[PDB]
DNA sequence: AATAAGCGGAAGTGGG
DNA sequence: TCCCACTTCCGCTTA
């Protein structure tokens, strides 16, 4: 199964949910979710994974926080904003 | 209060 | 056995 960080990077590359997620500074790998439209993106993640329950943005962000220690995605001190690592961006 | 983002410990599920 | 990569649940903090 695709990993969450890859799901998000693929959405940013394809532009399929441009009203739910966007680059802030693509060169730095910073991206931001829509306050009003992030739930639709979370729903898509859960359906892609085949999870038992409906996915919510809260649960998706709970998973995102676990990448902080290994570095694939870090939280930025701006609303709904995160940053991919250079390794993730280069792969 | 109502609303929202952010946090993480703990236990459960998947597929190795 | 026991880690992977989350998922689910719950309670708390700050604005
Ligand atoms: Na929120």
Q: Which helix (H) or strand (E) is A11 found in, with range?
A: helix A4-14
Resolution (angstroms) equals: 1.3
Sort residue A58 into left (φ over 0), alpha (ψ -120 to 50) or beta.
alpha
- The protein footprint on chain C, as nucleotides within 7 A of a CB, is 5-10
Q: Measure A33 CA to C9 C1' (Å).
A: 24
- For ligand 1, the distance from its centroid to the CA atom of residue A35, given in whole angstroms, is 7
Whole-angstrom CA distances from A6 to A9, A10, A45, A48, A72 are 5, 6, 11, 12, 10
Give CA angle at A87 (A49, A77), nearest 5°. Answer: 80
């Amino acid at each position: 199964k695709i990993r969450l960080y890859q799901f998000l990077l693929d959405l940013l590359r394809s532009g399929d949910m441009k009203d739910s997620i966007w680059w802030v500074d693509k060169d730095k790998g910073t991206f931001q979710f829509s306050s009003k439209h992030k739930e639709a993106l979370a729903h898509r993640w859960g359906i892609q994974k085949g999870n038992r329950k409906k996915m919510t943005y809260q649960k998706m962000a709970r998973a995102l926080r676990n990448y902080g220690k290994t570095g694939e995605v870090k939280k930025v001190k701006k609303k709904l904003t995160y940053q991919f690592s250079g390794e993730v961006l280069g792969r």
